[PDB]
Amino acid sequence: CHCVILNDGNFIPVLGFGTALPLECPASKAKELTKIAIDAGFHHFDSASVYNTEDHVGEAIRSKIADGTVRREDIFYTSKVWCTSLHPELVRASLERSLQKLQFDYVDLYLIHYPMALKPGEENFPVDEHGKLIFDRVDLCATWEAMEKCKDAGLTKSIGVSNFNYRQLEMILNKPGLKYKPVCNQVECHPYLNQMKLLDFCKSKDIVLVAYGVLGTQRYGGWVDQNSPVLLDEPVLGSMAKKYNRTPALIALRYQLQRGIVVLNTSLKEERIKENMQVFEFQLSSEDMKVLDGLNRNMRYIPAAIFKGHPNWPFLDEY
Amino acid sequence: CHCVILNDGNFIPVLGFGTALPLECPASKAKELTKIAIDAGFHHFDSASVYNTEDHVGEAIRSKIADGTVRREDIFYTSKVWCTSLHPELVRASLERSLQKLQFDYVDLYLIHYPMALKPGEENFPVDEHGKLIFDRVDLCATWEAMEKCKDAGLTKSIGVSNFNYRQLEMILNKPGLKYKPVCNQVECHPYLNQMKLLDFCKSKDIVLVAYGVLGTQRYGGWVDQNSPVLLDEPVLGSMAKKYNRTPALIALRYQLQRGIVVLNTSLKEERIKENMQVFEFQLSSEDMKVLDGLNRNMRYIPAAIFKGHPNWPFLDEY
Numbered sequence: 254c255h256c257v258i259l260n261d262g263n264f265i266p267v268l269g270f271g272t273a274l275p276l277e278c279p280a281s282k283a284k285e286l287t288k289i290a291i292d293a294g295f296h297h298f299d300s301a302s303v304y305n306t307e308d309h310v311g312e313a314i315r316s317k318i319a320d321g322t323v324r325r326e327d328i329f330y331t332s333k334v335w336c337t338s339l340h341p342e343l344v345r346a347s348l349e350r351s352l353q354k355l356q357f358d359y360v361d362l363y364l365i366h367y368p369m370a371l372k373p374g375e376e377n378f379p380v381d382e383h384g385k386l387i388f389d390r391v392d393l394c395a396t397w398e399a400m401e402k403c404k405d406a407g408l409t410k411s412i413g414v415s416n417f418n419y420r421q422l423e424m425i426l427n428k429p430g431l432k433y434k435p436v437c438n439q440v441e442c443h444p445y446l447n448q449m450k451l452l453d454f455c456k457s458k459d460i461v462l463v464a465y466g467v468l469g470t471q472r473y474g475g476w477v478d479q480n481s482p483v484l485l486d487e488p489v490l491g492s493m494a495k496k497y498n499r500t501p502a503l504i505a506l507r508y509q510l511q512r513g514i515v516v517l518n519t520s521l522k523e524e525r526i527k528e529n530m531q532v533f534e535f536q537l538s539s540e541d542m543k544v545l546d547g548l549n550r551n552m553r554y555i556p557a558a559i560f561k562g563h564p565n566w567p568f569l570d571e572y
Numbered sequence: 573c574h575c576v577i578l579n580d581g582n583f584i585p586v587l588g589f590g591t592a593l594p595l596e597c598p599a600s601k602a603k604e605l606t607k608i609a610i611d612a613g614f615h616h617f618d619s620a621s622v623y624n625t626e627d628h629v630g631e632a633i634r635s636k637i638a639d640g641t642v643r644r645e646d647i648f649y650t651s652k653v654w655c656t657s658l659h660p661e662l663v664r665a666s667l668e669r670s671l672q673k674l675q676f677d678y679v680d681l682y683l684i685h686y687p688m689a690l691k692p693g694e695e696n697f698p699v700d701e702h703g704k705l706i707f708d709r710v711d712l713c714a715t716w717e718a719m720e721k722c723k724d725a726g727l728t729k730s731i732g733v734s735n736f737n738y739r740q741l742e743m744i745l746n747k748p749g750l751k752y753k754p755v756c757n758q759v760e761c762h763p764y765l766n767q768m769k770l771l772d773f774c775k776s777k778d779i780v781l782v783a784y785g786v787l788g789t790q791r792y793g794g795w796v797d798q799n800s801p802v803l804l805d806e807p808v809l810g811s812m813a814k815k816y817n818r819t820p821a822l823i824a825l826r827y828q829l830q831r832g833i834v835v836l837n838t839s840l841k842e843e844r845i846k847e848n849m850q851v852f853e854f855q856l857s858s859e860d861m862k863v864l865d866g867l868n869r870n871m872r873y874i875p876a877a878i879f880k881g882h883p884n885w886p887f888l889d890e891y
């Protein structure tokens with residue numbers, strides 16, 4: 254497998270397929286896209302409880318195992334516990350519910366979606382009369398202890414985090430009695446926001462940086478500035494694509510793989526799912542990698558703006 | 573394909589089996605060892621016209637292709653033109669001779685063995701009455717042009733160099749009319765001689781550093797100081813071997829792979845040839861890599877001392 258090794262010994266495919274879909278897409282769409290992705294050669298699938306696509310994704314995977322296309326052990330499935338279940342006593346219950354939806358006995362990786370707790374309840378986005386999210390206070394170190402228990406319970410093989418800044422990672426890494434270090438930190442990363450600093454930090458701690466937004470994000474309404482520039486329309490990517498006889502998307506994907514990053518990607522088009530697998534066919538020169546490094550402009554497509562004000566908002570700029 | 577991509581688009585397996593043997597071993601020994609390597613999963617084999625083992629190595633490979641074990645396209649074979657054939661008009665004749673000994677239509681890689689020419693002739697080590705090598709002077713840029721022609725003739729898929737220092741690589745890289753940059757520079761590299769500087773330079777130029785002496789070299793008589801320390805006896809390697817439940821050799825091999833180096837290795841023992849393939853099974857922590865970086869002590873096992881007076885002796889410069 255085009256895999257890299259996690260700090261707990263487990264292997265993870267460097268190219269994963271994201272199962273989050275635009276609000277304008279029917280949930281069931283996730284099932285068909287997953288089947289196409291599997292046939293295209295994808296083994297790593299990224300999901301979350303908040304995506305409401307887990308049951309459909311699980312159906313596609315179980316279907317592909319049933320007909321002998323792949324085995325459960327060959328699939329790397331990731332889930333994430335949402336802000337409303339960060340309370341230590343609610344973490345495992347959330348994972349068990351996901352497993353129930355998937356018809357799985359275990360997930361390969363389980364992440365804390367955001368380092369920001371929200372009022373517990375069925376509603377994923379509890380708000381008051383002003384439409385403001387209802388924040389809740391939770392000890393993330395305790396949340397982590399609960400994640401470790403899930404690993405020891407065999408409900409998940411590995412555990413990690415998502416959307417954590419290095420300061421928050423250090424808190425966990427320096428935790429008294431720490432048992433398992435996060436194996437990864439899934440964050441937004443692309444030429445407009447190359448996370449060089451956070452990447453170097455993660456590498457120094459044996460933490461894998463898993464990137465989303467590698468192609469500019471699906472630009473979800475209510476989460477991304479619709480007036481922000483479209484990443485793949487960047488002239489530099491267009492020019493480099495022609496130089497290497499590839500596509501702007503392939504240039505953006507290869508850029509990250511060559512930096513030691515595990516990449517996620519999503520496309521609603523079958524032709525593009527297959528195309529993205531071609532990222533393993535070519536190499537970007539060291540000089541062109543520097544050119545791409547020059548596109549950095551601190552453009553964060555998903556700032557989780559509705560979370561601003563929360564004591565743990567992870568995206569404050571560096572000094 | 574546990575492989576990396578060369579600057580000419582071709583793929584090379586990151587772990588290769590070397591076929592040079594101590595003078596105390598019969599040449600035919602290479603046939604047996606190559607077959608064992610192939611059965612253990614090795615697809616990359618390193619040889620040279622000066623090793624006097626090409627015909628035996630070729631026979632093992634052809635034998636394994638014949639009985640259905642492996643395909644030629646799945647094998648990556650490297651040869652090297654010796655000092656006595658650096659004259660531009662003799663480079664191709666040497667490659668053609670190697671192909672004849674191998675009964676191959678092409679080699680995957682062809683290297684200039686040393687940036688030092690010796691008096692042309694059948695004798696690989698021409699000497700005078702004082703037992704000193706008879707040096708010759710050649711236009712290495714002209715030698716390179718001849719290598720480029722060999723690539724354009726399809727006799728070799730890629731071309732590179734071996735034992736070249738920074739200035740000598742520049743000599744080729746800045747050559748007016750240069751058509752193909754060297755895809756690699758095969759040099760000695762291990763914790764006692766980590767080549768930090770030369771490695772950084774090669775990466776900046778898209779040149780892969782291929783390392784020999786990864787396990788301390790076979791300590792050839794007449795080439796290696798028999799009183800020099802044995803690399804695999806290094807305490808740090810022993811302690812790390814115990815920590816990871818591996819072996820000193822596996823630690824030394826993995827150290828190089830994680831630095832982006834293509835590693836060669838040779839063993840006369842079947843058990844060790846099989847063992848070395850296990851290098852893909854574990855990961856050294858970032859902190860432990862730094863510990864290994866600390867062992868550098870400028871210990872060059874193969875200084876090519878009999879060539880020390882040659883105008884182009886490569887080991888005088890800092891790197």
Ligand SMILES: NC(=O)c1ccc[n+]([C@@H]2O[C@H](COP(=O)([O-])OP(=O)(O)OC[C@H]3O[C@@H](n4cnc5c(N)ncnc54)[C@H](OP(=O)(O)O)[C@@H]3O)[C@@H](O)[C@H]2O)c1
Pocket residue numbers: 270271272273274299300366415416439440464465466467468469470471472485500502503517518519520521522525526528529555
């Ligand atoms: N942990 C988190 O906070 C978080 C947040 C957001 C997303 N994610 C994860 O990341 C995954 C990816 O989502 P994303 O929003 O980051 O998007 P993305 O992977 O950056 O993709 C952005 C856009 O690229 C287009 N695209 C894909 N392949 C292409 C190709 N070969 N040529 C041209 N265009 C191509 C897609 O359009 P088409 O569909 O039209 O092809 C898509 O809208 C999700 O499914 C999820 O698993 C995680």
Ligand SMILES: NC(=O)c1ccc[n+]([C@@H]2O[C@H](COP(=O)([O-])OP(=O)(O)OC[C@H]3O[C@@H](n4cnc5c(N)ncnc54)[C@H](OP(=O)(O)O)[C@@H]3O)[C@@H](O)[C@H]2O)c1
Pocket residue numbers: 589590591592593618619685734735758783784785786787788789790791804819821822836837838839840841844845847848874
């Ligand atoms: N281009 C050049 O100038 C140049 C120069 C020298 C060599 N090379 C290339 O590099 C290849 C490697 O040769 P090298 O001299 O550098 O040696 P090496 O790979 O550094 O190996 C040195 C020693 O390691 C031992 N060893 C191997 N695997 C082991 C294991 N699992 N446990 C314990 N010991 C182990 C071997 O002893 P045992 O046999 O007793 O196991 C061998 O004598 C050559 O065959 C050749 O292809 C190139």
Ligand SMILES: C[C@]12CC[C@H]3[C@@H](CCC4=CC(=O)CC[C@@]43C)[C@@H]1CC[C@H]2O
Pocket residue numbers: 273274275276301303304305473474476555
């Ligand atoms: C932006 C992000 C992915 C897209 C989703 C969002 C939560 C609400 C949503 C509900 C949907 O039916 C479609 C996707 C999405 C818009 C997620 C919050 C964290 C991040 O993973």
Ligand SMILES: C[C@]12CC[C@H]3[C@@H](CCC4=CC(=O)CC[C@@]43C)[C@@H]1CC[C@H]2O
Pocket residue numbers: 592593594595620622623624792793795874
């Ligand atoms: C040291 C090196 C590999 C070992 C050989 C040496 C040339 C003479 C030799 C002749 C032999 O019959 C056995 C190997 C070796 C001792 C090579 C010169 C460059 C390097 O590849």
